[PDB]
Design a protein around this ligand. Structure first.
Ligand SMILES: Cc1cc2c(cc1C)N(C[C@H](O)[C@H](O)[C@H](O)COP(=O)(O)O)c1[nH]c(=O)[nH]c(=O)c1N2
Ligand SMILES: Cc1cc2c(cc1C)N(C[C@H](O)[C@H](O)[C@H](O)COP(=O)(O)O)c1[nH]c(=O)[nH]c(=O)c1N2
Ligand SMILES: Cc1cc2c(cc1C)N(C[C@H](O)[C@H](O)[C@H](O)COP(=O)(O)O)c1[nH]c(=O)[nH]c(=O)c1N2
Ligand SMILES: Cc1cc2c(cc1C)N(C[C@H](O)[C@H](O)[C@H](O)COP(=O)(O)O)c1[nH]c(=O)[nH]c(=O)c1N2
Ligand code: DMA
Ligand code: DMA
Ligand code: DMA
Ligand code: DMA
Ligand SMILES: [Mg+2]
Ligand SMILES: [Mg+2]
Ligand SMILES: [Mg+2]
Ligand SMILES: [Mg+2]
Lengths: 364, 364, 364, 364
């Protein structure tokens, strides 16, 4: 029955209108400065970068989405085999459903069978830490796919509007997560799920030892929309309230700025509405180490292996065109390339006390 | 005949297009910062707060609207009994009509019969203070409903365009109000009626002893539109002039800032176009002690008791979602939560000498 | 034939779409701060003010438009008799046509027959000063209507696009104007004609003794558009060029700021797209001494005396509404009332070095 | 092969929708301040200016476009003979095609036969410098048309999306350019091609001795769009990627500021979406020495000699109208005339560290 949410989630995400619904990444307020003399040739552009103890071919990852039933595993299988082929890391979807039901397990393990070398990232929700999950459940999530890291997701907005949601985010959870991390052999990433990570939340997680963040800002998949749709579907009164919250959250671009600023040494995934290699380039230039994507990977995967391969080919070409046209021979140069910040993003940073001088120095 | 006006007011506000007509709250310029780790659980959120010497369940009030005839009293009955059920304060409409006609009295008194515990707020207009009302009339308004406070409304814009209107706001009235307040056993609130309270107005009222304010800013019920409609209806020439004034006034959000800034210890109702618990959260976060609402309460009340009950359930849920998602365990924490101010509201504050640093400290 | 262009000007201005065509006054960036406690009564509001040596009932004037043929004089007759009834000053149209043709004279003189007490303002164009006009022609313009002042118009944008235009604006014209002003027994006002007065132009005129200005900024009657239509009509190639210039000039609001700032002691008419008594209030609050209007007066005058009477009644009502609602018992108080400046006007002032503190003090 | 590309470029530029496609010059953020007293007469305005060792009649040039086949030469012939008649300089299109194929030569030489006195500017692409071209090729391009200068184009964005493009911009190319310039008897201009010159690029070029720049900013011909169209036509996958890059580049107005700022003594052509004499005047007032145009000259030339004569007549009239209306007797006075800069261009300059005070002094 958690298993039908799982398919309903994928079905609404894949086929309903929830991508950027009434929301914004603020990435239109970021401009990469064009260099008419790049100083490089396209063919010498190098996109390799570090992902924990592995090297990856591109600074992009697929973030966690699904798992829990065999048709969901077939999607994970297509994503994982193509991610392997391209040398990109892949997070799986929440593994709760496979801690609760042994028959859900293969729909996650298939990822590692088909992708033996790339970084694979486990996944469990914060609310499960408040309800009993502890070290052993983390280790089971991890071994089930021989993960190189585990992502713990924050989705309080989703849970608030979810018909059968669990909006429990007591501080005790962080004490538990900090303890669990002492004992785990792989790092923890804390990621949002469409509503973004602010500086208050990043400093707080940081105070409990978390150094790896995934912004998942607003502007991309709108989980408040997804749950609004599930509410409409059951005639649940919450739907009209969800609609008032459609634009709730920290935009992706602002979240990247807030996390890089407030935790200058964090390992940062910039995600939530990254739809092109140009978006990916902007995310990294603003301050992320890697760009994350979920929804468009799902939509291509459902179309098939070849559609997904073409999708990555296009993302990668678009990333390298942005590096070419900013004179960035490598990911490190991209992180330092010249930008312009305009509009609401600029007003957001100013109000929030993001001194642009210190900002430029910190993103580099 | 003032009784026909009372009827025509309700009918135009309920059924014509005057909610936010050519006007704006500026609340879209206020963003509540999302906290992906709230640090609390939904179920522990506490919405109680003080309203003078009483405790109320939710920091929201229904502000004054109607009374004067038995159908108007049936509306007041429904609002009051639901307000009583939910532990929320209720203002009644202008009681002038019941000072002038004894047969109008029961349409107000019904409120206290059906709501014996909640704060009830009496109502008289400023222009009646310059025309002979004094202490006794205030006391009669109060005792008629065993009121816990009396609201004196400012409606000069309305009066100017009213067919019918009395635009008399001589300073003598304030002298009289200050004198009356010496003798009254309950507090006075001064409220606008759709065009908002500016800093010069709030400082002037304060200089005469007024400490309780209700912004009633523009962007909600447009009273200049309502009178425009009454002018059209009678082929009165003033209609075309009212139309040029549709966007006149201080936007709610700016008014909240101006009042809180210029009278930092004021008790503040933030109202005028509050249409969701999210709007209510923003109002409180910006500087108000409570959020006030009138028009959407009227619309639900007209549909009936159950519709009105559902409306409050939804407002309260939305308020709590916004507290949850900012990590606000209680009203006091919401007042201090992180915000961003952008766009025209930012420009309005800057031009008016609202130093944002000092604003932050003052709102807390 | 000059007589024909005068006919054609009125016809295009009255009947074609040239009011505010692709242009803006920037008055939407000026907000008058609402005072919910005005401290006054509508009936005590005083709108009297000084116009040179006379008193006028309202701080509004009708600016120069027409004259030159008998049907044009019938329009001047109607405007003048209504202006007399209301105690408002009236400028006449360029009197060149009546210096050149004695039969054109009565169409100006009728103004003074019918309006024996109000200020009447004569009119000649700056280009004529470089083409032979001097003292005697000014004195002839003045005595023809026993004028209390003479306006000299600037219209270089119009003359550039006019099929038979004279774009001659040699500095010698100012030397001549300065000399003439020594000898004249009435004051000179220099007025633009839909393209506005900048600070450089105001300071230059001031250096030659000019102390009285009429901004005639962009956003109201678009004279470039008028000449563009005349060019289309004659298949003149210039029409396409005029179209690129439709939005050329200083917006009225900016021009009022520029002139009041750069010449703090000037006598200032704020005009160019004043369409309501609210616009008129904003213009005075921004820095003008009086609001000027031309096109809407022509349109009403063409419809008849009673239409024109109704029009002034509405402007006056709207002006007094705005004074009531800002707590302005008189014109002097309106000049000092609180405002907000936002948007492009704000950015215009900042780029042009208009320090807002010193601005606030100067407008007063 | 390349001859076919040359024909398809002209056809797509002339007849498809690529002029300003999803892009912007930012010239709408530049306002020339109107001067109601210009202090000059239209007939005394002088538009002459220097272009290296020649005098040209108007501060406008036609920038390089075509050549390579006899129908392309017939367009070159028409533009050249009209340019000659008007005293305006003309660049030819890339001469690569005529270095590779001797039959393409006459389509360039024709320009000098028909325009013996005006400056003619040769053209080669920067990629060819890394691919074997050097002094001799430059000298051939120059003698082929007895050029007064040679433009070297930057088009890395075009090359990236061009189906058969060569994105090779190694620093060695600049080393070679600098060496060539020692030996050449005419100056070098470095020009972009629709995507604009940033300060980092201008400083880098300057460091290798280049002092002559042509902004060719985004907002006019969109070469990324043109190549997108060629990719669509060939079902080449890159088209979808080009589409994501449609708004890539430095807007013309921003590029003019960046170059004039970071290289104050540069000789500077402002181009990329100059469509009227008004645009031309803005470009010069902002900091360019001359305004450049390509696409609208092509579309006129294709209609014929008389159409192109009419086009120039219009551009020059518009330019002079803008001088007239700013009080600019000559090109030098235009470069110093008062402007306002607003909106995104203002935010762009602030973010990029362009101090407006120092900007003003340098643009003069
Ligand atoms: C269908 C599907 C389902 C999930 C997701 C999304 C998608 C589309 N996402 C959130 C996802 O990883 C990502 O953070 C957000 O979707 C923002 O990225 P995009 O805008 O989708 O690129 C998500 N995140 C998570 O941490 N655990 C989960 O199980 C899921 N589930
Ligand atoms: C039908 C009706 C009639 C009244 C009002 C409202 C409406 C809708 N309001 C104004 C109300 O108290 C509130 O200040 C404004 O309407 C702004 O709130 P809303 O935007 O309507 O939530 C009101 N104000 C008051 O002080 N005395 C009054 O009698 C009236 N009457
Ligand atoms: C039909 C007509 C004819 C003229 C004008 C206007 C109109 C509408 N105006 C310009 C006028 O006085 C005013 O400066 C502008 O029209 C801007 O004000 P409005 O936007 O029209 O209110 C004008 N100005 C002036 O100095 N002498 C002239 O003779 C003319 N004639
Ligand atoms: C048909 C065509 C062909 C060419 C171009 C343009 C056009 C439209 N342009 C670029 C051009 O010179 C100019 O920099 C840009 O087109 C921007 O100016 P416009 O917006 O077209 O005025 C160009 N530039 C150049 O240096 N060498 C050339 O071969 C070409 N070819
Ligand atoms: C976007 C995201 C985190 C989806 C998981 O939602 P959920 O609450 O259904 O996950 P779980 O299965 O962990 O409860
Ligand atoms: C919004 C508002 C204050 C309505 C009451 O106006 P009114 O002038 O009809 O009230 P009263 O009956 O007190 O004159
Ligand atoms: C708007 C305005 C000033 C019109 C008079 O133009 P004009 O050039 O025809 O006047 P004159 O008859 O004085 O040339
Ligand atoms: C806009 C511009 C510079 C066009 C020349 O393009 P190209 O790559 O076809 O030129 P070349 O013939 O020099 O390769
Ligand atoms: Mg969950
Ligand atoms: Mg009243
Ligand atoms: Mg004239
Ligand atoms: Mg090339």
């Amino acid at each position: 029955d958690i298993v039908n949410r799982k398919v309903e989630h994928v079905e609404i995400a894949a086929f309903e209108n929830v991508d950027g619904l009434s929301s914004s990444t603020f990435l239109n307020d970021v401009i990469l400065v064009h260099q008419g003399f790049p100083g490089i040739s396209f063919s010498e552009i190098n996109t390799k970068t570090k992902f924990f103890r592995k090297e990856i071919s591109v600074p992009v990852m697929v973030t966690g989405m699904t798992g829990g039933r065999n048709e969901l595993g077939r999607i994970n299988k297509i994503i994982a085999e193509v991610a392997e082929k391209f040398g990109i890391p892949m997070g799986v979807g929440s593994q709760r459903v496979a801690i609760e039901k042994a028959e859900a397990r293969e729909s996650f393990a298939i990822v590692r069978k088909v992708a033996p070398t790339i970084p694979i990232i486990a996944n469990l929700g914060m609310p499960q830490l408040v309800k009993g999950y502890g070290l052993k459940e983390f280790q089971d999530a991890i071994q089930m796919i021989e993960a190189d890291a585990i992502a713990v997701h924050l989705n309080p907005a989703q849970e608030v509007f979810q018909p059968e949601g669990e909006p429990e985010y007591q501080i005790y959870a962080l004490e538990k997560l900090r303890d669990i991390s002492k004992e785990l052999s792989v790092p923890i990433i804390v990621k949002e799920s469409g509503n973004g990570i602010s500086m208050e939340t990043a400093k707080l997680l940081y105070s409990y030892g978390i150094k790896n963040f995934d912004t998942s800002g607003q502007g991309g998949t709108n989980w408040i929309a997804i749950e609004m749709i599930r509410d409409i579907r059951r005639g649940n009164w919450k739907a009209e309230s969800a609609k008032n919250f459609l634009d709730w959250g920290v935009p992706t671009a602002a979240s990247i700025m807030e996390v890089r600023y407030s935790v200058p040494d964090s390992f940062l995934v910039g995600s939530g509405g990254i739809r092109s290699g140009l978006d990916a380039a902007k995310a990294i230039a603003l301050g992320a180490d890697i760009a994350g994507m979920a929804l468009p990977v799902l939509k291509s995967a459902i179309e098939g292996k070849e559609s997904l391969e073409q999708f990555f080919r296009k993302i990668i070409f678009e990333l390298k065109a942005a590096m070419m046209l900013t004179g960035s021979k490598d990911v490190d140069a991209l992180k330092k390339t010249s930008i312009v910040i305009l509009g609401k993003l600029k007003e957001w940073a100013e109000y929030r006390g993001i001194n642009l001088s210190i900002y430029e120095k910190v993103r580099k």
